Amino acid sequence: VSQHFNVYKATRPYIAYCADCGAGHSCHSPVAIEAVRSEATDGMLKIQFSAQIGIDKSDNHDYTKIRYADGHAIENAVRSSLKVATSGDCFVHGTMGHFILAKCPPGEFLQVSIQDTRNAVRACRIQYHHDPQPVGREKFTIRPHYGKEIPCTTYQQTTAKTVEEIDMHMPPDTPDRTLLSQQSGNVKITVGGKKVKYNCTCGTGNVGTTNSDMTINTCLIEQCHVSVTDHKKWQFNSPFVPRADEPARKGKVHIPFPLDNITCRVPMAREPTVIHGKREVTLHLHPDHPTLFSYRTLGEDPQYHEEWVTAAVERT
Amino acid sequence: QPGRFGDIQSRTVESNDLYANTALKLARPSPGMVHVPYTQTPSGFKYWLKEKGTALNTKAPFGCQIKTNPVRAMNCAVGNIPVSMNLPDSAFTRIVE
Amino acid sequence: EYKTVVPSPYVKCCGASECSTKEKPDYQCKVYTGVYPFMWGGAYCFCDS
Numbered sequence A: 001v002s003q004h005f006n007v008y009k010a011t012r013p014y015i016a017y018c019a020d021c022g023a024g025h026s027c028h029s030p031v032a033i034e035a036v037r038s039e040a041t042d043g044m045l046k047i048q049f050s051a052q053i054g055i056d057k058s059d060n061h062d063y064t065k066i067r068y069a070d071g072h073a074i075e076n077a078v079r080s081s082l083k084v085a086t087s088g089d090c091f092v093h094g095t096m097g098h099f100i101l102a103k104c105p106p107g108e109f110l111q112v113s114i115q116d117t118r119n120a121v122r123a124c125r126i127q128y129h130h131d132p133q134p135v136g137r138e139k140f141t142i143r144p145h146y147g148k149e150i151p152c153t154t155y156q157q158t159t160a161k162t163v164e165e166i167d168m169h170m171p172p173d174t175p176d177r178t179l180l181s182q183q184s185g186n187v188k189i190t191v192g193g194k195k196v197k198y199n200c201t202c203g204t205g206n207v208g209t210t211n212s213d214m215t216i217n218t219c220l221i222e223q224c225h226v227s228v229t230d231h232k233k234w235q236f237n238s239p240f241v242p243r244a245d246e247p248a249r250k251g252k253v254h255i256p257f258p259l260d261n262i263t264c265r266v267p268m269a270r271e272p273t274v275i276h277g278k279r280e281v282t283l284h285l286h287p288d289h290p291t292l293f294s295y296r297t298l299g300e301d302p303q304y305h306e307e308w309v310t311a312a313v314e315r316t
Numbered sequence B: 001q002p003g004r005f006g007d008i009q010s011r012t013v014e015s016n017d018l019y020a021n022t023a024l025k026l027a028r029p030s031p032g033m034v035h036v037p038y039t040q041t042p043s044g045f046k047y048w049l050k051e052k053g054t055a056l057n058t059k060a061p062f063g064c065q066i067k068t069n070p071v072r073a074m075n076c077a078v079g080n081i082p083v084s085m086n087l088p089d090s091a092f093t094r095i096v097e
Numbered sequence C: 001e002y003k004t005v006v007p008s009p010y011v012k013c014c015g016a017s018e019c020s021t022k023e024k025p026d027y028q029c030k031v032y033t034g035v036y037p038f039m040w041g042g043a044y045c046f047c048d049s
């Protein structure tokens, strides 16, 4: 059981750039979206996510918390505040770490949001098409009480054994302009419990202060540059944060919810009305939803036809 | 070719060649932010999964029923079957009987 | 269907880089001359151009 604990205890959430944070303005958010996957013919879609679901900021496994990142700290969010949305509103079938498992109405975008400790709403919105279609020859909406069974593919919630993984690396240097404190000609550096990489111009510079406060009595607060430089944890190699080395050594972490075979029920269209003409027949077709109708003759030249029928029609 | 069927190719499922012609192309980052823009023709498998056409299943002469993993055409109605038999002597009845 | 792999960009403050060819399919790599990333809460480089 401890394998999950170990794999999620070396990794932390991050902050990426979201171009539409729920109001049409960009921001740096803890809930930026990395990728939406849709391989299940069940209509399920699984989305990646910079925050981490199911793990406490204290690293314990809690199923009622989501841990995110603001600034340099890591706090806890109430798991009941997780919302996934499209044109309509979605149903969440499973969550673990960076991944959500939702089933949504058709839309033109996708939105996910949480509530931080201040009870503010942090959201990210991306453009996503999402026009799902069921299996078979009928475009139905809701499964019937009577029908047929056809093979389907979903995302099982085993979360245990998987072949696929994602890369992981060390975070880069994190700039922070609030670490500078100015006095009368003095430049105080208030380390908050974390090593700070350092570079000024006029006086000193180029020191990795392993948890040491300093003052500079020569330079100015506008003449320097600081950045938190500790790296004890991994994070996903997103294209919206930079990396720290060109050799670029990487880790790997198995992702949950693999693809599996399942059977999904489908309806059957009511048989049409057949009228026997001479060397031909007429069919009255009454569909409850778009339905596929085709015919062919059993000869040397088949003489076929195919069509999606959406309203009641007659075919000879 | 990009955006059409077989824009990426592979000899087998476990092969490790992976020919790819997807017209990938990088772009300069916009000033003031970290990101890696690029442009690339969308998948040709996904294009084919709409524009493929009508299957042999729908239009097959003589009422052939095109079937699963062993690709076969069940129950076509063409031709004649010559058959030759070698009956034993005990399969017949004497004229006097 | 394919999958485009896009790693984190490499930024070199007061420096320069060189493109390196690789064995991957449809692999592209470019280096852009003068940037100023502004990572978050800062500029991420102390180096104007």
Ligand SMILES: *[C@@H]1O[C@H](CO)[C@@H](O)[C@H](O)[C@H]1NC(C)=O
Residues within 6 Å of the ligand: A199, A200, A201, A205, A206, C014, C046
């Ligand atoms: C420190 O900053 C100067 C210019 O401000 C730059 O030339 C030098 O490379 C920097 N050193 C480090 C270690 O970042």
Ligand SMILES: *[C@@H]1O[C@H](CO)[C@@H](O)[C@H](O)[C@H]1NC(C)=O
Residues within 6 Å of the ligand: A153, A259, A260, A261
């Ligand atoms: C489903 O069954 C097929 C056999 O037709 C198999 O090839 C596949 O690996 C199974 N699992 C999937 C599709 O996830």
